[PDB]
Amino acid sequence: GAMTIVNRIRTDVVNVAKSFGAEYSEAVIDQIFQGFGEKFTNTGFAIRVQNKRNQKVDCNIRYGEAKENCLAWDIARESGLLSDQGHPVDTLIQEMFQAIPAIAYGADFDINYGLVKIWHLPKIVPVEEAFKIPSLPKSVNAHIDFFKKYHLDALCALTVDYRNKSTNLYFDAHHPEQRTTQFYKNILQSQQFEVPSDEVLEILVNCPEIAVTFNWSSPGIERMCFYTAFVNRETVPQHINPVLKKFAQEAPALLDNPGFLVGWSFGPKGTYIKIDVDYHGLVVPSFFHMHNLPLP
Ligand SMILES: [C-]#[N+]/C=C\c1c[nH]c2ccccc12
């Protein structure tokens, strides 16, 4: 009935989790919302489901805003959501904000765990700017030639994953070679990752954003992910996977006509789909704008 926007969001988040069989902790949800509920109501907020092989669907909630400072860090620290682990991740987001000016930041939470990531969004810069950051995994610098080969020259975001102890570099996929299916075959084969069906490859050619995941325990790329946006429910490729169908059709949004972001993740494990509902309708236009693309 009548309720605050933040209570509407909470209810919708729990409803999604229940519908998809995702695990969640009431204590963790309350802890997240105490700190971040107001942000969720007023900024680009999204609810994500993802379907890792041979395990339950995970439900994540996330937001971003156009502020130059990493406001999530202070909030997560005071909320009890971000304790030091004695690890490179502890100072990494701080180092990112020192090394490269941000135009925005964000955060991501798994409702059965807590804070998973904090994001740094600069203006698009040369990838080499990242090599200033002291605690980046050594594997990142070692992949300089790989980045050049696959036209991963234009860094558009960075994230720290405190749970997984990993970091992602995100690239603006501007190059015309990235509009070809062969690019995606090649980049996946380069890491011995499985190549998806032709149908999926034909979707990937519209991807504006590529993520590459690195970690401190291994010299290689952990996984990579290709992001594609769809401006309404009906244009999500629902036929590809039952979770896409169900979430496109049923995901809650406060706006009556939301878009979606879908991430196609690949790894050696690492291979699955992520789908976010643009709950207030702010995320998908922002995504096109940050990639210098007209809105579809
Ligand atoms: C990762 N990635 C790319 C975009 C994205 C997906 N969900 C949300 C939510 C709020 C802002 C950006 C955003």
Over the chain, what HEC string results? CCCCHHHHHHHHHHHHHHHHCCCCCHHHHHHHHHHHHHHHHHCEEEEEEECCCCCCCEEEEEEEECCCCCHHHHHHHHHCCCCCCCCCHHHHHHHHHHHCCCCEEEEEEECCCEEEEEEEECCCEEHHHHHHCCCCCHHHHHCHHHHHHCCCCEEEEEEEECCCCEEEEEEECCCHHHHCHHHHHHHHHHCCCCCCCHHHHHHHCCCCEEEEEEECCCCCCCEEEEEEEECCHHHCCHHHCHHHHHHHHHCCCCCCCCCEEEEEEECCCCCEEEEEEECCCCHHHHHHHHCCCCCC
Å from CA of 26 to ligand 1 middle: 24
- Our measurement of the distance from residue 155's CA atom to the centroid of its chain's CA atoms, rounded to an integer in Å, reads 15
Contacts of 71 (CB under 8 A, 6+ apart): 39, 65, 105
Question: How far, in Å, CA of 240 to CA of 236, rounded?
Answer: 9
Structural contact between residues 63 and 107, judged by C-beta atoms closer than 8 angstroms: yes
The verdict on whether residue 117 carries a ligand-binding annotation is yes
What is the rounded distance in angstroms from the CA atom of residue 238 to the CA atom of residue 251?
Answer: 13
User: Is 10 marked as binding a ligand?
Assistant: no
State whether the beta carbon of 261 lies less than 6 angstroms from ligand 1.
yes
Experimental determination technique: X-ray
Tokens of 233: 């429910």
* Interacting residues of 45 by C-beta distance below 8 A, sequence separation 6+: 9, 39, 61, 62, 63, 279, 280, 282, 283
* Residue 105 assigned ligand-binding role: no
**Beta bridge partner(s), residue 166:** 161, 215
Say whether 165 counts as a known binding-site residue: no
Q: Amino acid identity of 199?
A: E
Tokens of 192: 């011995």
CA angle 155, 161, 166 (to 5 degrees): 75
Resolution (A): 1.7
- Whether the CB-CB separation of 96 and 105 falls below 8 Å is answered with no
Atom of ligand 1 nearest to the CA of 211: 1
77 assigned ligand-binding residue = no
Question: Which atom of ligand 1 is nearest the CA belonging to 287?
Answer: 4
Which atom of ligand 1 lies closest to the CA of 44?
Answer: 10
Chain breaks in the chain (C to N over 2.5 A) after: 268
Domain-wise residue ranges, the chain:
5-290
**Token duo for residue 181:** 């299916």
The span from the CA of 199 to the CA of 66, in Å, is 35
Does ligand 1 lie within 6 Å of residue 63's CB atom?
Answer: yes
Asked if residue 106 has its Cβ within 6 Å of ligand 1, the reply is yes
Beta bridge partners, 228, equal 262
Pairing of strands 44-50, 166-172: unpaired
> Residues with Cβ < 8 Å from 246, sequence gap 6 or more?
19, 20
Q: Measured in angstroms, how far is the CA atom of residue 180 from the centroid of ligand 1?
A: 24
64 lines ligand 1 (CB under 6 A): yes
CB atoms inside a 10 Å sphere around CB 190:
13
C-alpha span between 92 and 159 (Å, rounded): 9
Any binding-site annotation on 62? yes
First to last CA, the chain: 35
* Closest protein CA for atom 2 of ligand 1: 227
44 lines ligand 1 (CB under 6 A): yes
Provide the token pair at 187: 């980049």
